[PDB]
Design a protein around this ligand. Structure first.
Ligand SMILES: [Cl-]
Ligand SMILES: [Cl-]
Ligand SMILES: [Cl-]
Ligand code: NA
Ligand code: NA
Ligand code: NA
Lengths: 94, 94
């Protein structure tokens, strides 16, 4: 869970309601997954962890709601989010 | 001003108080500059423009306050912000 946040590639956030930390390990797995996600209190924790460890936080309200509504922690991201997350990962990971 | 926002490389935001759109034209100028910046309603406008045009919005509270406190529109960014902005530009621009 939130112990894994320092290893997140990015966090997708909706201020100040939602945060979704994304994991990506292209050396091993073809797809990104959700490390941890939450709303309110828990979102604030995830945000605070990311800031501490220098993990990039992207504002994307529709994507954050979508990850929250359809995804699950420790599960590869929903198909409906795949391309938008990939855009983020494309530059972040270069 | 806010007409130039579609050409921004990134927006630095503090929810939901501050937005700073950053311009970068490494083909011509050595340094990034501030395209447009504001707080409250003006921040909301800048954010809305960026979302519409697919400009990446990064949540960085200290940097946003710093750009706001020391920078000016149509001026190369303050020295105190140069390295943090460069980190953002480094991946965004790859
Ligand atoms: Cl939660
Ligand atoms: Cl879950
Ligand atoms: Cl303003
Ligand atoms: Na957004
Ligand atoms: Na050019
Ligand atoms: Na921040």
């Amino acid at each position: 869970t939130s112990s894994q946040i320092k290893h997140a590639s990015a966090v997708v956030s909706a201020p100040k309601d939602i945060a979704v930390a994304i994991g990506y390990m292209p050396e091993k797995y073809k797809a990104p997954w959700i490390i941890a996600m939450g709303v309110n209190l828990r979102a604030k924790r995830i945000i605070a962890e990311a800031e501490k460890y220098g993990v990039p936080i992207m504002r994307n309200v529709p994507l954050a709601h979508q990850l929250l509504d359809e995804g699950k922690e420790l599960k590869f991201i929903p198909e409906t989010t795949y391309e938008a997350v990939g855009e983020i990962l494309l530059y972040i990971t270069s």
